[PDB]
C-alpha cells in the first residue's frame, strides 16, 4: 500500500543522481515526482528510488508549497548525507 519511506543518500559532485518534475504554483501545482535515476549514481546505488516515486521531503523540509526552483535549491543546498522521504506502493511483511 501507499506508504512513506525514508531514504538516506550521499551526494557526489553535489548530485543525488535522479531527475525531478513538479512543484507548487500560484495557480492551484503538482507533486514533486522522480522521473529518472542515473545508473551508477547515489540513488541508483542505494537502490530504493524509482521513476514515479513521489518526493515528499528533504531533511524534514516538506516540498508541499515549494516551487520547482525551490525544490531544486533545497536538493542543491542540503548536506552530503540527506534523508529523503518518498512515497510509493510498498510491500512490507513481518518475518
Amino acid at each position: 500500500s501507499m506508504r512513506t519511506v525514508e531514504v538516506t543518500l550521499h551526494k557526489e559532485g553535489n548530485t543525488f543522481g535522479f531527475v525531478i518534475r513538479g512543484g507548487a504554483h500560484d495557480d492551484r501545482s503538482r507533486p514533486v515526482v522522480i522521473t529518472s535515476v542515473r545508473p551508477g549514481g547515489p540513488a541508483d546505488r542505494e537502490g530504493t528510488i524509482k521513476p514515479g516515486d513521489r518526493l515528499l521531503s528533504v531533511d524534514g523540509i516538506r516540498l508541499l508549497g515549494t516551487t520547482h526552483a525551490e525544490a531544486m535549491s533545497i536538493l542543491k543546498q542540503c548536506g552530503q548525507e540527506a534523508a529523503l522521504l518518498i512515497e510509493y506502493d510498498v510491500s512490507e511483511t513481518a518475518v
Side-chain angles (χ1 to χ4, degrees), residues 1-25 27 29-75 77-79 81-95:
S1 44
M2 270 281 173
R3 295 220 153 286
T4 71
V5 173
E6 192 178 78
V7 172
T8 300
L9 296 182
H10 302 257
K11 288 195 280 187
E12 294 306 332
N14 206 39
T15 65
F16 289 110
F18 63 80
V19 177
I20 51 161
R21 70 173 172 71
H25 202 298
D27 192 1
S29 277
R30 301 178 201 255
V32 177
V33 173
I34 288 155
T35 64
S36 184
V37 171
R38 185 172 79 220
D44 192 35
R45 257 181 293 104
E46 189 280 351
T48 307
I49 292 171
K50 298 298 178 176
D53 293 348
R54 187 173 165 186
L55 181 57
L56 302 179
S57 84
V58 173
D59 295 329
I61 305 154
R62 188 80 178 72
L63 302 190
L64 184 62
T66 59
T67 67
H68 187 81
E70 288 165 345
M72 99 76 211
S73 305
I74 286 167
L75 287 154
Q77 293 168 201
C78 66
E81 189 181 8
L84 310 185
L85 197 69
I86 62 177
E87 176 173 59
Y88 60 96
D89 188 7
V90 178
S91 294
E92 189 162 62
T93 305
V95 296

